[PDB]
Design a protein around this ligand. Sequence first.
Ligand SMILES: [K+]
Length: 401
Amino acid sequence: APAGFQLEKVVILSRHGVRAPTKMTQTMRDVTPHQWPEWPVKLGYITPRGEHLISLMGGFYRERFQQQGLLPKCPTPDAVYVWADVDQRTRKTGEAFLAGLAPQCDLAIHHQQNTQQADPLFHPVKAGICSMDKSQVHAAVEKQAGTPIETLNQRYQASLALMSSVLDFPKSPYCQQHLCDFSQAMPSRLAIGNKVALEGAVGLASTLAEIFLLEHAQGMPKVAWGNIHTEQQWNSLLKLHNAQFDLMSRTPYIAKHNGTPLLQTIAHALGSNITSRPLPDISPDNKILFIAGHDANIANISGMLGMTWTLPGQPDNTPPGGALVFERWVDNAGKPYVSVNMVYQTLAQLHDQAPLTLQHPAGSVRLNIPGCSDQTPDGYCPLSTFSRLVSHSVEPACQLP
Ligand SMILES: [K+]
């Protein structure tokens, strides 16, 4: 931080930790002759190991926030607040974060009281806050791709060939029941206007690549049937996943519909004069706000703010436990600024369960907000400017009533 700057508040939008596959469909089973390995928990649940890996991040956050003078060297209950999505995986990630940040302090997490409905903070379109127009979705995704979607597979030939090899797709029951080239067999298509999906090879491979990454992060004895040997290969496979998220979650039209409530909540917590839905029982003296969500949430916020990144040592742009960390800093004369970093465990740190300390830290990338005309060279954006960007980026129809 520049000369005289002081950290005042932190807002962490974190993905949940290492989880089992959220689904295992007949198609997923049929695209390989290999057997998918069994997980120790129900579909979509965070594992005990994933909780531990989140706690290690909590421990890192504690050391960092102590160092920067924000936290004491148990915090007061007012100083730390957790809002988790209703899923087991997010709830337990919020708990695991507190177990690392403030061990055995019994700090509360919060979440929506009806866990049988979507939380509109995280899924406003699904919750029925607002809707999208089918023709505008189609147009926006095509523009984001810069190529017709029908030929998207051509752009990812190398990656799709590598997926095919890892799966042994030509030998699979799918190829037995239907040339059997992964890319040609499953052309990319957009399925749409409150439900939007990328169908075909890239969509499917995106899911599978993420599952392989989760297997590795879980320290499973056999990952992708032993077929992923190098970091290059991990990058090539996760490229498919990152691409699907660029199109389905970063595309500004979609990003603004699904991301508006979160961005308002984040902005308000940083000190913007943006309406946001108050979080129940939060203190005006709050110092750390931890929001436990999903990769789509991070990607939405990325899209809205025009923020892009690559993470050294981490093939997934939105890995389990990876978090956008927004910070309000003030200069010596009390002017507020916002910084944003994408803070994460490398693939190796996930696999090894590495302790994360000041000496051996989490990965961290400082993000540029391109529209922040008066940002400093080290990426500090005046709050006044940040607030204007937020005002321009939100979809008013999607603000939380
Ligand atoms: K294991």
